[PDB]
Amino acid sequence: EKSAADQIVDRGMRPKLSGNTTRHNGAPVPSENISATAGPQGPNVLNDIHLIEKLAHFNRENVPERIPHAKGHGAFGELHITEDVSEYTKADLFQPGKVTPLAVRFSTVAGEQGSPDTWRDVHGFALRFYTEEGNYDIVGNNTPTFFLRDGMKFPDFIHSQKRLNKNGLRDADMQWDFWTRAPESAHQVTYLMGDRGTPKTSRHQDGFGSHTFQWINAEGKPVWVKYHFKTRQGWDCFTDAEAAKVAGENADYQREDLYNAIENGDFPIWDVKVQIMPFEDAENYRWNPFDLTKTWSQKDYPLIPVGYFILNRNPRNFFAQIEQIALDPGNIVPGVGLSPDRMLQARIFAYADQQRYRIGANYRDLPVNRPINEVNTYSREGSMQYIFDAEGEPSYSPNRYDKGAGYLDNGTDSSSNHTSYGQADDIYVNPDPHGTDLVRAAYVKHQDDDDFIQPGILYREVLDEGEKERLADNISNAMQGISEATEPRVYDYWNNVDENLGARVKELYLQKKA
Amino acid sequence: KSAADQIVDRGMRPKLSGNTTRHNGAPVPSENISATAGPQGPNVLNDIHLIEKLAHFNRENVPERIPHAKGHGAFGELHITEDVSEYTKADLFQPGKVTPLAVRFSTVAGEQGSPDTWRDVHGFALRFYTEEGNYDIVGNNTPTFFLRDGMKFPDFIHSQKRLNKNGLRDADMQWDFWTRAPESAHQVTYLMGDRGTPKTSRHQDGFGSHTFQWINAEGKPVWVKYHFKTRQGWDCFTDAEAAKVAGENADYQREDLYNAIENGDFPIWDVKVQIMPFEDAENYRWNPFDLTKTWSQKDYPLIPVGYFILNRNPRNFFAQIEQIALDPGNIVPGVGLSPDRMLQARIFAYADQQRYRIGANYRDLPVNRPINEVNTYSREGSMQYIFDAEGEPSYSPNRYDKGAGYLDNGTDSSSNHTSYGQADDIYVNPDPHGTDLVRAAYVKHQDDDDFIQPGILYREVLDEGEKERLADNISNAMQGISEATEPRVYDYWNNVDENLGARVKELYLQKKA
Amino acid sequence: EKSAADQIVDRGMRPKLSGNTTRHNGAPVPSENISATAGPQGPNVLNDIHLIEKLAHFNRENVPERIPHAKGHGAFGELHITEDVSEYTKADLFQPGKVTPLAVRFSTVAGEQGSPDTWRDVHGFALRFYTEEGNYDIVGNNTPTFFLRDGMKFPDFIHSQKRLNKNGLRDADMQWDFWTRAPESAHQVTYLMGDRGTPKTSRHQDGFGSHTFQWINAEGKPVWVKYHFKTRQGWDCFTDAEAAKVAGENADYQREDLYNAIENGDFPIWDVKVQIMPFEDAENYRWNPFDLTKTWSQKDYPLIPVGYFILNRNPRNFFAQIEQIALDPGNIVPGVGLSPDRMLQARIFAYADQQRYRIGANYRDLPVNRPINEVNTYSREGSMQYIFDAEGEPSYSPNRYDKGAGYLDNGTDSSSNHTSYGQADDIYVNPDPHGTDLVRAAYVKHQDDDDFIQPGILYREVLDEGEKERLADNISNAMQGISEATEPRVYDYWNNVDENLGARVKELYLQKKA
Ligand SMILES: NC(=O)C1=CN([C@@H]2O[C@H](COP(=O)(O)OP(=O)(O)OC[C@H]3O[C@@H](n4cnc5c(N)ncnc54)[C@H](OP(=O)(O)O)[C@@H]3O)[C@@H](O)[C@H]2O)C=CC1
Ligand SMILES: NC(=O)C1=CN([C@@H]2O[C@H](COP(=O)(O)OP(=O)(O)OC[C@H]3O[C@@H](n4cnc5c(N)ncnc54)[C@H](OP(=O)(O)O)[C@@H]3O)[C@@H](O)[C@H]2O)C=CC1
Ligand SMILES: NC(=O)C1=CN([C@@H]2O[C@H](COP(=O)(O)OP(=O)(O)OC[C@H]3O[C@@H](n4cnc5c(N)ncnc54)[C@H](OP(=O)(O)O)[C@@H]3O)[C@@H](O)[C@H]2O)C=CC1
Ligand code: HEM
Ligand code: HEM
Ligand code: HEM
Ligand SMILES: [Cl-]
């Protein structure tokens, strides 16, 4: 417990072993060097049991990588609460003085396993807190916003960032064809194409929940919140050229950086802060507060400190604890809720769904995925069931025994006779839906909602001249390879962000087109 | 000849003779003797055919369905003989249409080897290969069901299957669940009557059970329920007879159907609907969206649509029946859902299990492909047999011509605040009766309770022999329940009807030694 | 202006489609942009069927990558026979005048499927010929030899080339610890550390079967053979530094090169040649002829021309036709046999074993894996069974019908009554086994057999002075990061190859270390 995470990371690990190897049934292995033949020059025999066992398990080492965020790495640590936010949330892990074990995984998005850490890309920033009321995951990114506001479009974006169907090549035309035809992408593409598209390490970047979530206090009062994880190491970014150079020198530069830092006792820290928007502020804010492509201005809603987290433990086994971790924004806990962000709501479905396939039906039972409290469930069976309920316990509720049911239920019947429980605050306390029908509709339109104002503000009001110039230079690099059909779409896109940025992008682009 | 012939021939090899080949096409030396290093020497590793043959044998089994593992089916045709175009624009239901079909029949609780004639609900699952996509009506041989909320479905199904400790099915478990979930009473009464043991798949009705929606060319909705009325007529075993046949032929109904079709005795069902005007819903005496409530045929009589006939046996049972992926979520223009929470859970659940039970690309298998071309941006996944034309885009919106949704413009992401309005293709919704996410009861209609409908069946519909057999069947099914469950069951049946309840207890006590 | 492989490459491809999209049941998709909600600001509904279907299938796009050789790419083409080799083999594809469709996949070995093509590594060179007597695969490498002579050691070598269990980092100490303690590796490590460890493209390298195989003629007479695929484009290699620079600029450099070459009509060609060792020559050759770590001298066995192959077709769909191809040395055909090469014998089991898992039980039925002749098999069922036998055909043999049995069988009974078939020449005509017992034994020891003489010969008699210096430089670079425990073991390993090479390796290593 020299990290509070020691209880978690030690789960499943064998003691150190010596002497001679054994087969998987426990019988001694004769040789790891020579296989059995019928005569020295005779054929290999079928019944070299160790040989076949060794080859067959070797043949099954690989599992499907994540889509997206295949390339990643992580660590374990502790969340420490230093402020009192109890007036906003009853979430157990956020109460005063609470110390909670965590896991984190960082990643890129588009590239596969083995792809370089320092390709220009968004970086994943995904936390698990092992709380007393269950695992609470905040699966964030190193950006406060994102490319889209509807999950229907997510697989379109991700195919466009991956490889063409015909030849397995990533493609500039495809990336820009998608982005310019999905102009809601403007805010995040501006962020991505700036310095922060190439952070040097996982330690030298902020993390964000990106989405608006909900906090609910002990008396059932909700507020809207956004999470901000502010690096104590500070933002530090490569130039476009530097990142590509590092990609060739060390494709695992960030994975290695984090390992070395923790091994050397240089434990990275982030200050945990939130923006808090009162429930009553939501409808009249200048931007739609639930549109992922819109950040809340920190002038309107400043960061409020909560505490900090520290990464102080490397994994014991990378594959077992990091590759197999199943981080999921749907892992919420009491005191935390969702919001009418359609991207978030799609995510709440999508992660567990992929994980049931990528890992297996019983992925929740793996050491790194089990919570610290006992799971009380009627789920059973499935492939590779390691853990099962006490002998003879019932498989169904309501039942005549004592296993139990939901906290809203009485534990003895099916809640018939027209029983109602009321508002599902554990999902979220909803605002006005603005309609009574199943629809495919726009988000409620707020005064300053469009696809371009916020990245325009970033360019005009936040970025210094160097940042503005590198942005244009980066963009024009990224455009190399687009078709002639795509060129004017890209010019238009950037002009819509800012006419000066757009002019400079085109200027540099034509210079390089040679 | 059958309209299903083009479907059912997909994937089938020509008959082959001569000698066998390995899976790479090379000649097999022997199917009888394996290669050894000397006649009495060890088997060699590199008998390639031996290992290939053993390894593929080792991989023949796949997860059976949960539930409805034990089943069997056929192919056929739907024929429209009436004009229902005022109610629906669904292509397959338009005047004169003839549509190829598939069907799978099944029990519910038992596993792959279990008997067809255990007392159980029977599945009645149809696929129509329409010009506008596969439309599946995944029904049962009952117009109702045990529950009104999908949250409870795995509880019911575990209670119908085996105890975790010893792998035995269990009467106490079945009745403990049924009596503590009294919404079950309508279907339990149906299940425990004669129709719990139909002799064959041909001698039972089918039903969609749920309220669905039909929408016409002008966008006007009506609520509908499907009824498939058997031309062979209901014909049921007694409790004792079904149990006897269960041991004599575990595949009684599977064999019966295959034989009937081989002999040219093609079974036929008349396809009819009940149609409830959209404006009738709120004031009907029962909640029209509660699965445990039937619509009275006195209030809404059956309206004829056409008939379907089964005239084709599968070419290969595993390939075409075990691997068929029937799914109530396979709807088509002109058909919609309803605020039935059981139905809404099913719309998710089937494709979810199928992605696992069969594979991510299960839709590409011959029996699961529609007759029209699929135009999708989905790609890759295990065992991808079918892929798009070379170089076609993987994303939309794009600058090419593959296309997008019929609501979309095909060129952009529908930003700038584009709205499409009511999602009628899902269903034209009635009043939700609230503005908040809630866990709530169904809207309460005047005669809604858990017992009135099976009581009416018993008191007003069942004849004297049916009433007595019902009590006899229930008391048989009760044998083995714990003393802690007996009084709960007595009261349950009293709630249905006091005379039924009295008779059930009387017979139960007689049989209890 | 097409290809003989067009029949293969078109299997499974849809026609071009336009209009609007459909769900997977064929019904029209309402939108690819907006998901359905209960009110514009209400929750997403569960029954957006298209949303869930699109996300769920997106979630299942990935499959396990190969272990090893995850990162690869390929093409299709034609094998043309130009010489008469019928005196040596009856194999159909090798008969005079035969033109046979082919597939090829090139690859690296260690890295995962996003990793750079131009990491220093062995490159895979794996061919499939779609012959009239089945698919014949020659799954070779760009080297005539390899690191080991026993499949028992293969998973040890491959872990040592992949990532440490604790942190997911590849590791120089691990690579050299294994190589030096398994000194049979010396031949291939010398090849790997030379110029050929970094070929510029897939087109500018030779290919080899590496193992000794067997050819059998129509009369049943065997000879031992080795396959050589000599590039008409010529060897062309990066330096160690250039290869890393390219890895950062374009991780898919070689994938892109091959695609572009074929797209442009610059079809790469290799001349197909064999070495042929008479059956009577094997026991008295100066080296063991079945030891993968021993090449046959081309002074003793010159190359004999057979024909050439040309790559003239890019895949229609990369994932469907390349990622899912199941290349397998066990795919032999009449006229071709194996040998007492233990590595080869282990491979004959291992590939189909992995493919059953990596792809699925029915992987043989996928378009790219089906032969051009009809498969007549009693195998049945299994996940995703697309193809099934004619209605009512029997599932077992011997049977009273016509489907048949093996060519040695009579088609009517089980071959009891003590029926014997004799020597299994279809596997191979074996030489003497040199013993009568199941053993774990060394290979038969030939006069000049050791772990170091052949790369010593390469260094002393083949390499030019620049090649000799680059070799020492490359080695010393690859040694950076090894522990002090490993240093003297590496110094000694290189001295065993050659005292002068050894001295220069140590010299440069100590220079670079600081
Ligand atoms: N939560 C938010 O509102 C965030 C907004 N932004 C961008 O800043 C604009 C103004 O937001 P508002 O909060 O009103 O303004 P503020 O002035 O209060 O803050 C601007 C934000 O932009 C960040 N920033 C500085 N340089 C870059 C850059 N190179 N690339 C990306 N971000 C950078 C700042 O980080 P720092 O303090 O370290 O300089 C700060 O968090 C928005 O349009 C948005 O695009 C960016 C991050 C968070
Ligand atoms: N969709 C529906 O309205 C159906 C309802 N039921 C049951 O009938 C009751 C009355 O419904 P309503 O339509 O108003 O009355 P109706 O008289 O108009 O129809 C009653 C239905 O009950 C059927 N029935 C007859 N014997 C049995 C039995 N052994 N087990 C199950 N069903 C049987 C009849 O079949 P048949 O005409 O062939 O004799 C008929 O379909 C309901 O409470 C319900 O339990 C049952 C089937 C359909
Ligand atoms: N199958 C074989 O016999 C091969 C053996 N070797 C190596 O060559 C040595 C001598 O064998 P032998 O055939 O008797 O001699 P040969 O002179 O007849 O052939 C030497 C081989 O070495 C190749 N070679 C040239 N440069 C390099 C290099 N930078 N790295 C690796 N290989 C290179 C040659 O290719 P090229 O003609 O184009 O110059 C030629 O194939 C062996 O010890 C073996 O290590 C290498 C390739 C094939
Ligand atoms: C509707 C939009 C999105 C969908 C459908 C989606 C879906 C997914 C899925 C299925 C995975 C793989 C999970 C697994 O297999 O374990 C994943 C990975 C990931 N996603 Fe999302 N995503 C979306 C948008 C976002 C957003 C907005 C963020 C950040 C706020 C985000 C952050 C991440 C991170 C960090 C990972 C990697 C987690 C890890 O390291 O294991 N994604 N996404
Ligand atoms: C919310 C409640 C229900 C859920 C979650 C559910 C779920 C399922 C699932 C996942 C399957 C297996 C599908 C497959 O693997 O191919 C199945 C089988 C089946 N279910 Fe349902 N079911 C529900 C209620 C019903 C109802 C009400 C009916 C009839 C109206 C029904 C009829 C059937 C039939 C006929 C099959 C077998 C289809 C076949 O023959 O392949 N189920 N159920
Ligand atoms: C006993 C030693 C070896 C074993 C057990 C072994 C096993 C394997 C396996 C299981 C695969 C993945 C197959 C798949 O999933 O499709 C593979 C890939 C491959 N191996 Fe081997 N291997 C061995 C040595 C060799 C040798 C000596 C060569 C060359 C002569 C070679 C060439 C290749 C190539 C080219 C691939 C990639 C094929 C492709 O591009 O799809 N391997 N190896
Ligand atoms: Cl799955």
Percent helix of chain A? 25-40%
Number of helices of chain A: 13
CATH class of the largest domain in chain A: Mainly Beta
Number of domains of chain A: 3
Bound molecules: NADPH dihydro-nicotinamide-adenine-dinucleotide phosphate, protoporphyrin IX containing FE, chloride ion
Name the structural class of chain A: alpha+beta
Q: Report the CATH superfamily of the largest domain in chain A.
A: Catalase core domain
Rg estimate of chain A, integer Å: 26 Å
Please give the alpha-carbon distance between the first and last residues of chain A.
60 Å
H/E series of chain A, N to C? Answer: HEHEEEEHHHEEEHHEEHEHEEHHHH
| Oligomeric state of this protein | part of a larger assembly
> Quick one: overall form of chain A?
globular
Explained architecture:
The PDB classes it as oxidoreductase. The structure is cut from a larger assembly and holds three copies of chain A. With 514 residues, chain A is an alpha+beta fold. The first copy, chain A, has three domains: 1-62, Cytochrome C Oxidase, Chain J (Irregular); 63-145 and 197-370, Beta Barrel (Catalase HpII,  Chain A, domain 1); 146-196 and 451-514, Up-down Bundle (Hemocyanin, N-terminal domain), CATH 1.20.1370.60. Chain A contains 13 helices and 13 strands. In chain A, strands 2, 3, 4, 5, 6, 7, 8, 9, 10 and 11 form a ten-stranded antiparallel beta sheet that branches. In chain A, helix 12 (486-497) packs antiparallel against helix 13. Chain A starts with 5 loop residues before the first helix and ends with a helix. Strand 13 (438-440) of chain A pairs antiparallel with strand 11 of chain B, so a sheet runs across the interface. The complex binds NADPH dihydro-nicotinamide-adenine-dinucleotide phosphate (NDP) (3 copies), protoporphyrin IX containing FE (HEM) (3 copies) and chloride ion. The site of one NADPH dihydro-nicotinamide-adenine-dinucleotide phosphate has 17 residues of chain B, from helix 10.
